[PDB]
Enzyme design. Structure first.
Site, mmCIF file in Angstrom:
data_model
loop_
_atom_site.group_PDB
_atom_site.id
_atom_site.type_symbol
_atom_site.label_atom_id
_atom_site.label_comp_id
_atom_site.label_asym_id
_atom_site.label_seq_id
_atom_site.Cartn_x
_atom_site.Cartn_y
_atom_site.Cartn_z
ATOM 1 C CG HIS B 42 -0.388 0.424 2.361
ATOM 2 N ND1 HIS B 42 -0.075 -0.343 3.554
ATOM 3 C CD2 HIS B 42 -0.370 1.587 2.945
ATOM 4 C CE1 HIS B 42 0.584 0.460 4.583
ATOM 5 N NE2 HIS B 42 0.245 1.739 4.172
ATOM 6 C CG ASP B 88 -0.148 -3.376 3.105
ATOM 7 O OD1 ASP B 88 0.404 -3.276 2.047
ATOM 8 O OD2 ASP B 88 -0.450 -2.947 3.884
ATOM 9 C CB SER B 185 2.557 2.067 6.183
ATOM 10 O OG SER B 185 1.497 2.392 6.739
ATOM 11 N N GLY B 186 5.029 -0.386 6.221
ATOM 12 C CA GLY B 186 6.081 -1.038 5.473
ATOM 13 C C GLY B 186 7.604 -0.970 6.459
HETATM 14 N N1 LIG Z 1 -2.086 2.535 14.215
HETATM 15 C C1 LIG Z 1 -2.407 3.129 12.884
HETATM 16 C C2 LIG Z 1 -1.624 2.881 11.778
HETATM 17 C C3 LIG Z 1 -0.151 2.088 11.775
HETATM 18 C C4 LIG Z 1 0.759 1.813 10.682
HETATM 19 C C5 LIG Z 1 0.534 2.634 9.356
HETATM 20 C C6 LIG Z 1 -0.624 3.855 9.349
HETATM 21 C C7 LIG Z 1 -1.528 3.822 10.661
HETATM 22 N N2 LIG Z 1 -2.718 4.504 10.360
HETATM 23 N N3 LIG Z 1 -2.454 5.909 10.888
HETATM 24 C C8 LIG Z 1 -3.711 6.490 10.973
HETATM 25 C C9 LIG Z 1 -3.965 7.977 11.333
HETATM 26 F F1 LIG Z 1 -2.995 8.530 11.753
HETATM 27 F F2 LIG Z 1 -4.761 7.845 12.482
HETATM 28 F F3 LIG Z 1 -4.503 8.577 10.550
HETATM 29 C C10 LIG Z 1 -4.573 5.560 10.335
HETATM 30 C C11 LIG Z 1 -4.170 4.458 9.861
HETATM 31 C C12 LIG Z 1 -4.549 3.314 9.213
HETATM 32 O O1 LIG Z 1 -3.778 2.424 8.916
HETATM 33 N N4 LIG Z 1 -5.861 3.585 8.979
HETATM 34 C C13 LIG Z 1 -6.528 2.359 8.381
HETATM 35 C C14 LIG Z 1 -7.737 1.875 9.005
HETATM 36 C C15 LIG Z 1 -8.252 0.515 8.402
HETATM 37 C C16 LIG Z 1 -7.895 0.101 7.174
HETATM 38 C C17 LIG Z 1 -8.580 -1.052 6.377
HETATM 39 C C18 LIG Z 1 -8.047 -2.558 6.752
HETATM 40 C C19 LIG Z 1 -9.067 -3.550 6.254
HETATM 41 C C20 LIG Z 1 -9.793 -3.281 4.977
HETATM 42 C C21 LIG Z 1 -10.077 -2.043 4.645
HETATM 43 C C22 LIG Z 1 -9.262 -0.926 5.355
HETATM 44 S S1 LIG Z 1 -9.927 0.543 4.470
HETATM 45 N N5 LIG Z 1 -8.467 1.282 3.926
HETATM 46 O O2 LIG Z 1 -10.258 1.571 5.591
HETATM 47 O O3 LIG Z 1 -10.828 0.447 3.738
HETATM 48 C C23 LIG Z 1 -6.810 0.707 6.575
HETATM 49 C C24 LIG Z 1 -6.073 1.762 6.854
HETATM 50 F F4 LIG Z 1 -4.756 2.593 6.522
#
Ligand SMILES: NCc1ccccc1-n1nc(C(F)(F)F)cc1C(=O)Nc1ccc(-c2ccccc2S(N)(=O)=O)cc1F
Ligand SMILES: [Ca+2]
Lengths: 52, 234
Positions: B42, B88, B185-186
């Site tokens: 991603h 991912d 991420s990654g």
């Molecule tokens: N502990 C968080 C984290 C760890 C590592 C990297 C990024 C994050 N964050 N940081 C933030 C913040 F900061 F709050 F904005 C937000 C995120 C994040 O991952 N949101 C997220 C939440 C849900 C999903 C998701 C899963 C499965 C299927 C579809 C989706 S979907 N895409 O919804 O259709 C994907 C995301 F990407």
């Protein structure tokens, strides 16, 4: 427990062959003479923090 | 990284930073060998053209131990989709070989069965990155690390409003305010065994950061060892 008993005394990978423990190492490491320890082959083996 | 601690000199040598055209890091990665970097699929959307920096710990200035590598080939798992975030994972082959030194070293790739029986059953793992230090905030200019407990698979499925596939595993805390965050991420999720660190996961996602009742989601490296091996050949 063989591999289940303190990783069979292996430094890294532990497998069970002929119902016996067999140790192995990641690339960049050589299995020591005792068949348990893993000896790095270069100055920067994988998985080792560089604290020197 | 929310909470956690700064990666001190030489503590996270396998950390890689993906940088866009403006030389700003937008995702992390893990050094697997002199030519290969492991990261999240991603992330390959967060920027078109990008390069990889290794040996960096402080984004503000240039110590002299950092090195930039152009990417020769990008190998993203063809099954990844933002709809599920499943699969991912991505592997990058660099144009030039990384020179290992202080703060620049690869993390070990473990064997499947052993990793699952011995590494993923350990109490904790370590995640790291230059990500946000709060849900709302700028990226960290300092590399941070965080010890995250492995989380019961049934417990995390229950706590998740999203499906946790077999290619994902959970780590972190239920209420304690520490977790990976946007930008991490990654990055690497590694597990220590007898002072040797093996890559066990890839920072993937989470519903917010350090939110109560929510855990961090990571790509399970053991589910793609053969895929990774094939990538490091073609
Ligand atoms: N502990 C968080 C984290 C760890 C590592 C990297 C990024 C994050 N964050 N940081 C933030 C913040 F900061 F709050 F904005 C937000 C995120 C994040 O991952 N949101 C997220 C939440 C849900 C999903 C998701 C899963 C499965 C299927 C579809 C989706 S979907 N895409 O919804 O259709 C994907 C995301 F990407
Ligand atoms: Ca620097």
């Amino acid at each position: 427990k063989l591999c289940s008993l303190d990783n069979g005394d292996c430094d890294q990978f532990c497998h069970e062959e002929q119902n016996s423990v067999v140790c192995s190492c990641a690339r960049g490491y050589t299995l020591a003479d005792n068949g348990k320890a893993c000896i790095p082959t270069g100055p920067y083996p994988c998985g080792k923090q560089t604290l020197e | 990284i929310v909470g956690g601690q700064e990666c001190k000199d030489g503590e996270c040598p396998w950390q890689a930073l993906l940088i866009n055209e403006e030389n700003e890091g937008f995702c992390g990665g893990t050094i697997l060998s002199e030519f290969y970097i492991l990261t999240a699929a991603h992330c390959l959307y967060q920027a078109k053209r990008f390069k990889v920096r290794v040996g960096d710990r402080n984004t503000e200035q240039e110590e002299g131990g950092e090195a930039v590598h152009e990417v020769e080939v990008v190998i993203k798992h063809n099954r990844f989709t933002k709809e599920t975030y499943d699969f991912d994972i991505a592997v990058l082959r660099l144009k030039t070989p990384i020179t290992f030194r202080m703060n620049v070293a690869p993390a070990c790739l473990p064997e499947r069965d052993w990793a699952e029986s011995t590494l993923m059953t350990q109490k904790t793992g370590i995640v790291s990155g230059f990500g946000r230090t709060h849900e709302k905030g700028r990226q960290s200019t300092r590399l941070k690390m965080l010890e995250v407990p492995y989380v019961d698979r049934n417990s995390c499925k229950l706590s998740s409003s999203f499906i946790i596939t077999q290619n994902m595993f959970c780590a972190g805390y239920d209420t304690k305010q520490e977790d990976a965050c946007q930008g991490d991420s990654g990055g690497p999720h590694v597990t220590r065994f007898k002072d040797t660190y093996f890559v066990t996961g890839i920072v993937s996602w989470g519903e917010g950061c350090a939110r109560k009742g929510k855990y961090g989601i990571y790509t399970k490296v053991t589910a793609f060892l053969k895929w990774i091996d094939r990538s490091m050949k073609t």
